[PDB]
Ligand binder design. Structure first.
Ligand SMILES: CS(=O)(=O)c1ccc(Oc2cc(F)cc(C#N)c2)c2c1[C@H](O)C(F)(F)C2
Lengths: 110, 106
């Protein structure tokens, strides 16, 4: 069985700037319920800081993968465990600000 | 009543741009640590869809009473509050919130 997972892109603050529509079946929100909001707003109070420090670190790691586990509030208001694997991308023909590519998977905490 | 009422100001995306110091002796937060952050970071999960609805009412009507919601206190537990929100437009520039603390802590 394939895990449910969706792709998103964020700015360095954490704001969703792109959402893969596989999110409907993963967390039950439509893409536009995600777009423009920070990922920290769907996150469990106990895990918000770790997620903030994750986004801060992802940019210092030379575009290598950073993984984080946190509880994400589905459109049902249920806490789902997510593993978000993230990395920076920065097109080297330019000097535009790097952004963050995330893969977001519903995993088991056990 | 009065010593349980504080003002906050928000951008149209719900981030704090200002908060009365009074929020310290009631909920624990320092105002400075509040700015740049979505109010959304702070609602209890069970009030979240309701606040979203009030926010929609607030943007469409221009003034709303939130009805009852819980805010994650600074040092654990949740405080109940009721807020009156008012959009200040100029000639939407910001949201003024009058925030009344219903309960003590948890
Ligand atoms: C929905 S409402 O009543 O206008 C409202 C209430 C609290 C609101 O923010 C606040 C202010 C506060 F002191 C504590 C909390 C919490 N938790 C949220 C907001 C609103 C508006 O959405 C807003 F954008 F201005 C932000």
């Amino acid at each position: 069985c394939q895990p449910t997972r969706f792709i998103s892109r964020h700015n360095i603050e954490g704001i969703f700037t792109f959402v893969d529509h596989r999110c409907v079946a993963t967390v039950g929100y439509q893409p536009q319920e995600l777009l423009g909001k920070n990922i920290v707003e769907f996150c469990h109070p106990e895990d918000q800081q770790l997620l903030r420090d994750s986004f801060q670190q992802v940019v210092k790691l030379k575009g290598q993968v950073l993984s984080v586990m946190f509880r994400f509030r589905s459109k049902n208001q249920e806490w789902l465990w997510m593993r978000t694997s993230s990395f920076t991308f920065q097109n080297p023909y330019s000097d535009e600000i790097e952004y963050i590519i995330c893969t977001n998977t519903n995993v088991k905490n056990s | 009543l009065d010593s349980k009422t504080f003002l906050s100001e928000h951008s149209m995306d719900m981030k704090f741009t200002y908060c009365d110091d009074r929020i310290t002796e009631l909920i624990g937060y320092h105002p400075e640590e509040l700015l740049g952050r979505s109010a959304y970071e702070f609602y209890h999960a069970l009030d979240s869809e309701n606040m979203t609805k009030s926010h929609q009412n607030l943007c469409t009507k221009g003034q709303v009473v939130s009805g009852q919601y819980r805010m994650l206190a600074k040092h654990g537990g949740y405080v109940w509050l009721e807020t009156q929100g008012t959009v200040i437009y100029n000639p939407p520039q910001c949201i003024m919130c009058v925030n009344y603390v219903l309960s003590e802590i948890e």
